Amino acid sequence: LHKEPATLIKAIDGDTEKLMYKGQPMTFRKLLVDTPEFNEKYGPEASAFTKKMVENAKKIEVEFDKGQRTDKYGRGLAYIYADGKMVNEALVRQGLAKVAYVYKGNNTHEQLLRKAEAQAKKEKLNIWS
Ligand SMILES: Cc1cn([C@H]2C[C@H](OP(=O)(O)O)[C@@H](COP(=O)(O)O)O2)c(=O)[nH]c1=O
Ligand SMILES: [Ca+2]
């Protein structure tokens, strides 16, 4: 897989940012994860964690997997990196998302995120508390 450039247009919630990619505005949805929505428990904390991570980053990058690159809503599907740190992975690691929506051929980082969730679950972090 390879990292490609984008710039933050706006942090939306745990699951999504609007990013500019190849010069065009797009909503991106994070592969392999599910954060609580805003009114659910840890929903606000997930959005704050993502917002801070992507807003403080000097460099935002997107990384597509082998399969579908846009979902049925036209959202880009990618792993998102903030100064080289994967945001998808860091949400799970922190107990602010679960590994979810693991589809065949779009799941290269499945095992890496499942390990992160195991540790968050072991530390009883947030969602796992
Ligand atoms: C993460 C992800 C979601 N989706 C679709 C499936 C779900 O459909 P439905 O809207 O029909 O449930 C929806 C979940 O996204 P959200 O968790 O952002 O709602 O997005 C994909 O098709 N591919 C993906 O990789
Ligand atoms: Ca969600």
Ligand 1 atom index nearest CA of 100: 1
- Whole-angstrom Cα distance, residue 122 to residue 3? 30
Residue whose entry in the numeric block shows the structure tokens 């979810």: 100
Q: Is the CB of 61 under 6 A from ligand 1?
A: no
95: helix, strand or coil: coil
Domain ranges, residue 9: 1-129
15 is in an annotated binding site: yes
Q: List, in order, residues 6 or more apart from 21 with CB less than 8 Å away.
A: 4, 5, 6, 28, 62, 76
Distances (CA, A) of 52 to 8, 15, 47, 48, 62: 12, 14, 9, 6, 17
* Helix (H) or strand (E) segment spanning residue 7: strand 3-13
Domains: count for the chain: 1
Which CATH number covers residue 45?
Answer: 2.40.50.90
Ligand 1 atom at shortest distance from the alpha carbon of 15: 18
Residue 34 labeled ligand binder? yes
